[PDB]
Amino acid sequence: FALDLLRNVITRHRSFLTVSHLEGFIPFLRDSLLSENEGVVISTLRILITLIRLDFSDESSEIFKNCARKVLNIIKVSPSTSSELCQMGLKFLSAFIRHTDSTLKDTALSYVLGRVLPDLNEPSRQGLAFNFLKALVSKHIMLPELYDIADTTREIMVTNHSKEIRDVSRSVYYQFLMEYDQSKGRLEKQFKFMVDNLQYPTESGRQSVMELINLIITKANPALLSKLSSSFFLALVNVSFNDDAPRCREMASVLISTMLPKLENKDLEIVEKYIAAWLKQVDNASFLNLGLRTYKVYLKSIGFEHTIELDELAIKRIRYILSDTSVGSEHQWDLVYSALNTFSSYMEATESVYKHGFKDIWDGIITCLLYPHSWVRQSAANLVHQLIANKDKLEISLTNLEIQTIATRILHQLGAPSIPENLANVSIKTLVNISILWKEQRTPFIMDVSKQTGEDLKYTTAIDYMVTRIGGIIRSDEHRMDSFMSKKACIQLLALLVQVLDEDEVIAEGEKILLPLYGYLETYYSRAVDEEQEELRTLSNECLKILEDKLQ
Amino acid sequence: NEYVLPSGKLSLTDMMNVIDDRQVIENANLLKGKSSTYEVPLPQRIQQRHDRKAAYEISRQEVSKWND
Amino acid sequence: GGAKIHLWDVNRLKPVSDLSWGADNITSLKFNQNETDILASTGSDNSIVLYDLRTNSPTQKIVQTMRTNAICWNPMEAFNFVTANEDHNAYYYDMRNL
Amino acid sequence: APQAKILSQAPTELELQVAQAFVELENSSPELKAELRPLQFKSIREIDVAGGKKALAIFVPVPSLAGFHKVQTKLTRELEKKFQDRHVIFLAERRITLTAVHDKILEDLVFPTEIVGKRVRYLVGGNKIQKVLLDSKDVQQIDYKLESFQAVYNKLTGKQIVFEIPSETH
């Protein structure tokens, strides 16, 4: 009752609690520690933990050392660490060695470490053992087996299944590496250890090692960093190339991009020489793709055109991919997509898109749009959307025949069965922009001299031809489920083109637009109507409302 | 995405060898090693069984001193 | 012995270590006389388990047809012991080759 | 769809990952796709095993549990590759006949290995040693699985029972 009253008094009033008042109560606590009643000892230990967290005098510190020895005897008597008395004794000793300058015997501390060593794996018991270990580390007491404890914590780091235990072991291992003095060979062994565990069977273990090396890169001195950072960059490039986990690969890219500015000029020059080496070794396609990805990451990290020779080599590789980027090319589709992403990044970072060489790059982008891969087609569509705005700012603007060919490529992408939603929306926006440009220039439909259809043109204008192609693609039903989103995007683009085009052109293309629209509109009160068919019918109704607003 | 794109896997040792400068390979001393990565942990019973086999060999070597 | 084998100390009121091989009870114990760090024990699962205190671990286990009742180490040979059995027999054993 | 593959109304992160692995297996094999199209898992829970390990227990309705018992081997062979170093085991929900429920849970854990026997040893002082003797058809992979089986069974049923193979001395 007295202990509970005292606990309530200090836990309720903090201003009333003073150092001078409780100095008389401390001997009653050291006398109550010897009590056989477990509740009495536990309440005494709560109050004693609070009083150690509070500041006191030298005599009170001596009584605290007495309490520490009695608590150590309690720990020896308690047979399991799961026991509440043993747990509260561990809390007491952790708070004692945290907030008191007095220390126990090293043999006693070693004994407590030996008891709490198995607890570091199990999630139920790990927190208190790690509290004790963190207190010992922060007070920096030197023990013979603390190095083996650190090895155990790095094993827990790599292999443990629990994220919280991995994080706390990471904190303990980091504190041990930063604070505790070690041999140079031991430190080099630890760094080679981290680099080796970057290639680990468990993706969670790899990610934990990556967070540890992230802390190393952030808090490390640059002089000590660079000698490690060479092998770090090599291994991180290996992970970003060869790891099965896309999250791990993205984290490797992020870690490399974070380590690049902190790296010294010599390390950046070595990395740029390596980038030039993988880019020049163009015999292996995946090797060149890894070089191009590394060059793009280095450009995004350090800035555009930091190394003019490396930028020129990457541009030459991209030009080689554009020269061989048609259907049936030897280059991989993933390599072509990576080259397209690098070219998009270079066009974003540079004004070189206006040049005639980048006009050949845009021709290669048109070839990449003709390429059957969906990701490459989407990248080419994004490049075409950029070049739509950049074409007026370009030295040589895109021709009307080139715009018609781009619209034909967009129509081919729409008529393709499988298309991404973002790619379909991009194609609809590009078709709307091309229709607006054709309406502004009054450009008629263009037929190539080399490739003649042999009949009269169905539509007089290029915008009318695009609208007729969109209507035909919407009306086509070879794969109704796959092309449903394409038909919805084509209906939206037809509404946009009806809004953009002139009223006479809208009146001319109204029949062609309504012909795909009347297909869903003809079916009324269908017994089994598809949800995609109903959505297409709603889009066709919206397009018909837009057409009725345009023309009475 | 590049992470979504598949690897044609290339070895880290292959990249270090394809690096032309031997000075770079000398500077990347932490990369060169005896491959000290951890194995996946065994089940606890199996690991204890291996530890007990090791203890058996140590005990036999200690007690064969009395044979003379 | 008992449910688990425990190594104690006379200066400590609770067991110093737990040496049990699995979840089986242990009936009888015997310390080696010469190599004093070796222990042997009998279990109710027809098992004889050796222990070494330098490694602080249960060294090896043998399973026989019936339960062994008692064990005695040779005073003159550190690596031989006799086990009494329910076979109506006793068996003389070399520790190195069981 | 992972939400369609999972029978639960609210997916979890691990449930969504497992359903994505199921969809990957269905895309890989059409016969396995035909098997997994009616098959759905009701819940997932992750059970602690000593040594820091954690195992997956996936709780499936009974006639779908029959389908997973029919298709266990390929599914666990795919899931051990997909989810790293984690023992995945399929059980049903048996809401609580408690002895029969616990016996069904035991058989579901030790599937597809037979239970040779069950024994209880009463010691002096009231101690009990409860043992389950398993079949020795596929000995090597059971040996790694024994402490996982014991931990999952102790967590689910509240009874600690030793598992052992009587054929091999351990």
**Count of beta carbons in the 10 Å neighbourhood of residue A498:** 25
Q: Which distant-in-sequence residues (6+ apart) come within 8 Å of A295 by Cβ?
A: A275, A279, A310, A311, A313, A314, A342
In the three-class reduction of DSSP (H, G, I as helix; E, B as strand; rest coil), residue A75 is classed as helix
Measured in degrees and rounded to the nearest 5, phi and psi for residue A145 equal -100, 10
According to DSSP, the residues that pair with C62 across neighbouring strands are C48
A263 with A223: CB under 8 angstroms? no
Q: How far apart are CA A343 and CA C43, in angstroms?
A: 75
A473 with A479: CB under 8 angstroms? no
Exposed/middle/buried for residue A493 (C-beta within 10 Å: 0-12, 13-18, 19+): buried
Residue A17 vs residues A6, A12, A13, A222, A234: alpha-carbon distances, Å: 10, 9, 6, 49, 59
Q: How far apart are CA A301 and CA A303, in angstroms?
A: 6
Q: How far apart are CA A26 and CA A170, in angstroms?
A: 38
| Token code pair at residue A508 | 């001319």
Nearest residue in B to C37, CA atom: B59
Q: Which distant-in-sequence residues (6+ apart) come within 8 Å of A264 by Cβ?
A: A222, A225, A226
The secondary structure of residue C96, as a DSSP letter, is S
CB atoms C60 and B52 under 8 Å: yes
Residue/partner pairs of A251-254 with CB below 8 Å, 24 or more apart:
A251/A207, A251/A210, A252/A210, A253/A297, A253/B2, A253/B3
> Where is the binding site for ATP, in residues of B?
28-35
In the three-class reduction of DSSP (H, G, I as helix; E, B as strand; rest coil), residue C4 is classed as coil
Chains with 3 or more CB pairs under 8 A to chain D = A, B, C
Q: How far apart are CA A72 and CA A85, in angstroms?
A: 11
Q: How far apart are CA D168 and CA D163, in angstroms?
A: 13
Q: Concatenated DSSP letters for D33-60?
A: HHHHTT--B-EEEEEEETTTEEEEEEEE
Q: How far apart are CA A410 and CA A419, in angstroms?
A: 11
Q: How far apart are CA A512 and CA A523, in angstroms?
A: 18
CB atoms D84 and A162 under 8 Å: no
Task: Show which of residues 195-214 on chain A sit within 8 Å of chain B, judged by CB atoms.
Answer: 195-197, 199-202
CB atoms D85 and A122 under 8 Å: no
| CB of D86 less than 8 A from some CB of B | no
Which of A202, A231, A247 faces B30 most closely, judged by CB atoms?
A: A231
| CB of A155 less than 8 A from some CB of B | yes
User: Which residues from C are below 8 Å from B67, CB to CB?
Assistant: 79
Q: Concatenated DSSP letters for A353-412?
A: GGSHHHHHHHHHHHHHHHSS-HHHHHHHHHHHHHHHHHHHHSSSPPPHHHHHHHHHHHHH
How close A423 comes to chain D (CA, Å)? Answer: 22
Hey, where are the domains in chain D?
2-167
Q: What distance lies between CA A273 and its chain's CA centroid? A: 27
Q: How many CA atoms lie within 13 A of D75 on its CB side?
A: 24
Q: Which distant-in-sequence residues (6+ apart) come within 8 Å of A78 by Cβ?
A: A85, A86, A89, C14
Q: How far apart are CA A186 and CA A198, in angstroms?
A: 18
Which of C50, C55, C96 faces B64 most closely, judged by CB atoms?
A: C96
Q: For chain C, what's the residue count?
A: 98
Q: How far apart are CA C3 and CA D127, in angstroms?
A: 8
Going by their DSSP bridges, the two strands D88-92 and C90-94 should be labelled as unpaired
Q: How far apart are CA A94 and CA A7, in angstroms?
A: 20
End-to-end CA distance of chain B: 72
Nearest residue in A to C14, CA atom: A77
User: Which residues from A are below 8 Å from D50, CB to CB?
Assistant: 121-122
Exposed/middle/buried for residue D72 (C-beta within 10 Å: 0-12, 13-18, 19+): middle
Any idea which residue has 């199990």 for tokens? A122
Angle between helices A106-116 and A58-77 (to 10 degrees): 40
CB atoms D147 and B41 under 8 Å: no
Angle between helices A400-415 and A484-500 (to 10 degrees): 150
User: Which residues from D are below 8 Å from B43, CB to CB?
Assistant: 51, 53, 143-144, 146-148
In the three-class reduction of DSSP (H, G, I as helix; E, B as strand; rest coil), residue D163 is classed as strand
C28 with C69: CB under 8 angstroms? yes
Q: What distance lies between CA A102 and its chain's CA centroid? A: 47
* Of A391, D92, A515, D126, nearest in space to C2 by CA: D126
In the three-class reduction of DSSP (H, G, I as helix; E, B as strand; rest coil), residue A212 is classed as helix
User: Which residues from A are below 8 Å from C14, CB to CB?
Assistant: 76-79
**Experimental approach taken:** cryo-EM
The secondary structure of residue A443, as a DSSP letter, is P
A439 with A502: CB under 8 angstroms? yes
Task: Show which of residues 12-31 on chain B sit within 8 Å of chain A, judged by CB atoms.
Answer: 12, 15-16, 18-21, 24, 27-31
B32 with B25: CB under 8 angstroms? yes
Q: What distance lies between CA C87 and its chain's CA centroid? A: 19
| Token code pair at residue D81 | 């590759």
User: Which residues from B are below 8 Å from D147, CB to CB?
Assistant: 43-45
- Angstrom resolution of this structure: 3.0
User: Which residues from B are below 8 Å from A341, CB to CB?
Assistant: 2
Nearest residue in B to D141, CA atom: B43
CB atoms A79 and C12 under 8 Å: no
Q: How far apart are CA A111 and CA A131, in angstroms?
A: 16
Q: What distance lies between CA D103 and its chain's CA centroid? A: 14
Query: Can you point out the beta strands (E) in chain C?
Result: 6-7, 17-18, 26-31, 38-43, 47-52, 57-63, 68-73, 80-85, 90-94
Going by their DSSP bridges, the two strands C26-31 and C17-18 should be labelled as unpaired
Q: How far apart are CA C36 and CA D123, in angstroms?
A: 30
Residue A74 vs residues A87, A214, A290: alpha-carbon distances, Å: 10, 42, 61
Measured in degrees and rounded to the nearest 5, phi and psi for residue A434 equal -65, -40
Any idea which residue has 């041990």 for tokens? A176
In the three-class reduction of DSSP (H, G, I as helix; E, B as strand; rest coil), residue D115 is classed as strand
Exposed/middle/buried for residue A205 (C-beta within 10 Å: 0-12, 13-18, 19+): buried
In the three-class reduction of DSSP (H, G, I as helix; E, B as strand; rest coil), residue A145 is classed as coil
Q: How far apart are CA A150 and CA A137, in angstroms?
A: 10
